[PDB]
Amino acid sequence: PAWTGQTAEAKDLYELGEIPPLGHVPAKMYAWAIRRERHGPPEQSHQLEVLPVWEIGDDEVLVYVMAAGVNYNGVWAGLGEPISPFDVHKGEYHIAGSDASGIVWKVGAKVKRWKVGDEVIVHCNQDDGDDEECNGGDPMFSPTQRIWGYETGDGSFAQFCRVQSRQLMARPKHLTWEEAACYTLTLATAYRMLFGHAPHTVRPGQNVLIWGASGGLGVFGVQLCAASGANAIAVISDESKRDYVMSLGAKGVINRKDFDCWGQLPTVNSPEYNTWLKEARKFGKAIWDITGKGNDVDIVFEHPGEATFPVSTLVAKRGGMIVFCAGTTGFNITFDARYVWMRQKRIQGSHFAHLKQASAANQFVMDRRVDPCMSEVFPWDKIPAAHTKMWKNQHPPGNMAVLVNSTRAGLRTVEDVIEAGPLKAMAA
Amino acid sequence: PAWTGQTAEAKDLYELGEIPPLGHVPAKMYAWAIRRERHGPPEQSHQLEVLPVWEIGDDEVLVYVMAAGVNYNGVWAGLGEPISPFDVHKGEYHIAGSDASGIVWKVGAKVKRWKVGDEVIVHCNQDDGDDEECNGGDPMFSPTQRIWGYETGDGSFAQFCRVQSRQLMARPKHLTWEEAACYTLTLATAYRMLFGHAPHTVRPGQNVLIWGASGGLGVFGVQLCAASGANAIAVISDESKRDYVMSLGAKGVINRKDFDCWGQLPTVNSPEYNTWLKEARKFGKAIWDITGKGNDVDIVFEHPGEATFPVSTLVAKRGGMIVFCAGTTGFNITFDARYVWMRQKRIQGSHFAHLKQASAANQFVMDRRVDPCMSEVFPWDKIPAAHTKMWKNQHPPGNMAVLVNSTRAGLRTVEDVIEAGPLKAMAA
């Protein structure tokens, strides 16, 4: 409430960073929406509209959005593949965006934890709140679970978005709006992988193979390991990337381009299967050269999938886990039953994270023990462009972000957004 | 000690069931041994020799063998594939057999738990006893772990075998010698699968898909489920087998021959992949018809491998585990990454079991809550024949057994073995 009266008048439509009086809610807002006939490339399917501000219920909340995050799923949405969201919800239009920072503007009748004017970031997991798994087990195992901004169109690429109370976490005051908004989805996901599957969690001492260490997922495996006592073993495909990952806490690096052990699992007992095992073993020593010899990784941290899995299942210690949330290079997974059963290795699928997980992760960032690693930030009018950049992989390592009501890069407080000035949302 | 003096004199070689005085150990014994040049079909590679009785150490024990069990591994040994045991141990010859019932005849200097004349059955797991995993963790994760009678040639197809104290469990007085000796290896294995991988263990209420329900492994999944409150869902390939498995506790049956969803995973997005999912779904309802609808199995209990895995990974509930110890139909495992990561399913390899596991299992049998299911029993001179029968799958459902010092089928006590009479070990 330092800035309660330096605001604007009560009206039904504001421009970017034109702060309304606290708790006043305009009939309308500006947004980046998708409709079923637009479906296609981000610059084609994401177009700019003026829509009504979301109606909210008993346990929901409304957020004035300062910045947001760019993730792959916003592309799958604009694409309508692998599926269209309109085959998931009954909506006429869809507002994407699954990461965010901003202010709470209005709360439901039953909301006590959070209060109007509180500064927050947003976790993307939602459920109906009332079955066995959401009340005693793991809420990610409820059929009711879904991802906000993907399987819902009340996402964050708009002046306002609608979220459940159970999606809100406190914002780190030490970050810019854009930094606060880039990491939660990707950080929380990686946190579930490494701490959310007892008894195969990370402990001081362990060695963890991290695939694609420069990726949005990669950078967070590396940091979380280091920040906990463990020893991340990064993997990359460009030697200019070496310094980067190593300044993060990495305890070694390796480059996949040196080998050929890539591709599905050669049918067994065939020479290819024998030439395959030959190089892959080279890959194995590559670790021991870092880890010491006889020292296989406690956890493989997977996501490329089809092309590497055969290998990942080989290098993991007896009693070790190979966890993963994607298959960026194919889904025909393959592996040699012999290796995982004799050495009793766990192959564990994983998928985002839940509030208590996202918020344990958020704490590492609040204590400054982990850093969002924001790759770069685009402005409100470049949002579809920002997505196109991910599409064909031309983005820099780390996590992109885009601006909303925050009118310029580098802004931290709401006072900063005011004095920097309102901005036209729809000009051309 | 009811029969301490109805024995024979002190000599250095006895015939079958010619009981020596308690604690007297003959210089020599009769056995079924393998040597590297014999390698081949069981009837070729298992030949009959007279060898010295094993020397034993501080924590080891010597057992007078009444009956033993027949398992696949005795065939892989005689075969010398996938490997020869002589590439594992430095021995000139090898005595196979990984299951057994009998009397303790001699104990090491440091053996307090067990005493001479005690009646026992044998678990096949061994380790060196002195690293981290054997002293605080799971001893199956020690590099020192190995299977007795396979990776060692002091097995049970002989008048005497040598075992570690940590392999011994008490024998159920209510069984015949052969019954007591058929089940431990196969029972314990299945017990680890269903109770040895927290937090995905069996609980009253759960539904568990059991592949090959008539198999030595199958029958024990079914019984253990039922005996615990769960609901085994058997799978078979002969309708004459239906009554069998259902009298065991099964709560339903299904027959794989009706479908075609068998084989590796059709490359994705291809019509075959679409026709594949079509039948497999039929397979899924087949369950709900038994389980109720919306009710996916908590645990798939796998072992056929390559040909079914694609399917097994589909039918398991979100948060469910697919555990397995074999790949009897290939090792090029395959599955759709999408299914296991979104529904966060665990794919867990497993391999035999450890003492505390084998002995929890043994308790079910001691309370008469589980039954060995002995398929049939061959005599001492048919042991290689018994193995040949497994080789090409012509054995009846359940678990085979063969006789040693027990001179006739149906004998229970040692008194019974005496009055039934000694028997010539080597006649032709």
Ligand SMILES: NC(=O)c1ccc[n+]([C@@H]2O[C@H](COP(=O)([O-])OP(=O)(O)OC[C@H]3O[C@@H](n4cnc5c(N)ncnc54)[C@H](OP(=O)(O)O)[C@@H]3O)[C@@H](O)[C@H]2O)c1
């Ligand atoms: N379903 C979920 O729960 C969930 C949540 C978040 C993200 N994801 C997924 O996880 C994936 C990546 O996330 P991200 O933030 O890391 O995106 P990203 O920044 O594009 O990550 C790509 C990184 O992976 C590495 N990589 C790409 N292909 C590789 C290959 N063939 N072999 C080895 N490394 C390879 C690259 O690093 P190098 O070439 O230097 O090794 C690259 O830096 C995407 O599929 C995304 O959808 C899934």
Ligand SMILES: NC(=O)c1ccc[n+]([C@@H]2O[C@H](COP(=O)([O-])OP(=O)(O)OC[C@H]3O[C@@H](n4cnc5c(N)ncnc54)[C@H](OP(=O)(O)O)[C@@H]3O)[C@@H](O)[C@H]2O)c1
């Ligand atoms: N490494 C370990 O820890 C360990 C320990 C013990 C056993 N094993 C292994 O487990 C396997 C079987 O053990 P077992 O005692 O059950 O031997 P088994 O008695 O021969 O089991 C075979 C059973 O599996 C079923 N089956 C065979 N092919 C099938 C297929 N293509 N699809 C569906 N079902 C099929 C059959 O039943 P239906 O045709 O009626 O369905 C048959 O009754 C072997 O590979 C054995 O080596 C491994």
Ligand SMILES: [Mg+2]
């Ligand atoms: Mg991002």
Ligand SMILES: [Mg+2]
């Ligand atoms: Mg058997």
